[PDB]
Amino acid sequence: ATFEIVNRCSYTVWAAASKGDAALDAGGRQLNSGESWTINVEPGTNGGKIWARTDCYFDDSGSGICKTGDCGGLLRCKRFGRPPTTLAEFSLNQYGKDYIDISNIKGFNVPMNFSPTTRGCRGVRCAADIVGQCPAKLKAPGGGCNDACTVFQTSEYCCTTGKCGPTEYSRFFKRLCPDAFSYVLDKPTTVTCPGSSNYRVTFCPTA
Numbered sequence: 361a362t363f364e365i366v367n368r369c370s371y372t373v374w375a376a377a378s379k380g381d382a383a384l385d386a387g388g389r390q391l392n393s394g395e396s397w398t399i400n401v402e403p404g405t406n407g408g409k410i411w412a413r414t415d416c417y418f419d420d421s422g423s424g425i426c427k428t429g430d431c432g433g434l435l436r437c438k439r440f441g442r443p444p445t446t447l448a449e450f451s452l453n454q455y456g457k458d459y460i461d462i463s464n465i466k467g468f469n470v471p472m473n474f475s476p477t478t479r480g481c482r483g484v485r486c487a488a489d490i491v492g493q494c495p496a497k498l499k500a501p502g503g504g505c506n507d508a509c510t511v512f513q514t515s516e517y518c519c520t521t522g523k524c525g526p527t528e529y530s531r532f533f534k535r536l537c538p539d540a541f542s543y544v545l546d547k548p549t550t551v552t553c554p555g556s557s558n559y560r561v562t563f564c565p566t567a
Contacts, residue, residue: 361401361452362558364477365410367391369564373470374413374426376437377401384408387436390416391563403453403556410448411441412470412563414503427503428469443467444504446486446540448474448561458553462486463541464533468494469504473565481553486537487566495532507533507543519544 365375372392377384377399385399401408415427422435429441444467452458461484462474468490475483494505508517508529515521517529524545526534534542539549 361403361405361458361556362477363399363401363410364560365391365397365399366560366562367393367395367412367564368562368567369393369412369470370567371414373563374416374429374435375410375561375563376413376429376431376441377408377410378431378437378440379405379408380440381438383436383438384410387438388413388431388434390435401450401452406451406454408450408452409440410450410474410561411445412472413441413445414469428500443510444469444500444506446470446472446490448472450474450559452557453555456555458555458557459550460484460553460559461541461548461550462537462539464490464537465507465509465541465544467498467500467505467507467510468533468537470563471565471567473560473562475560475562476553476557477560478554478558481551481557484539484549484551485565486540487564488536490533490536493532493536495529498529498532517543 413429418424431437
């Protein structure tokens, strides 16, 4: 499956793509404002994620740090990134279908649209200025808007006991971005696409 990753932000982002225990394709690349990077994701990839990283510094060997979404200091990500990170989430060829969503469960850093480029399903979008509107107690100094679980580490925010409900903090994410997961047990906003669909992830889709 092909994923075109497009940076529409006025600032440089370092795109990242991983399934948690491996990179997808090269795993990461710099995208200056306006740049597009096409990756290939193996069919059957379960629990894949794409995200943006901001304010990164890397030496010639691809080692450094990002202010948001840092993946163990690598340019080419092999693992998930340090929250807060807006997440494009996908599992491909799962009994013949693909499943896509955007999640704010691990906080928000950069707005995104995640859409098919092929027929037969809709895209998902979280384009609002969540960082600008972020509640004081969730603001990351590093940058971005933390999820409540990350900040407070309680059973209720983290959904440990398995029966969590919405909260003042989850409802903020949900108000700003109705079409993204705001907590673990949120009413799903996952879209069913034809198996082997192709996709575009756009950072700053309104911009």
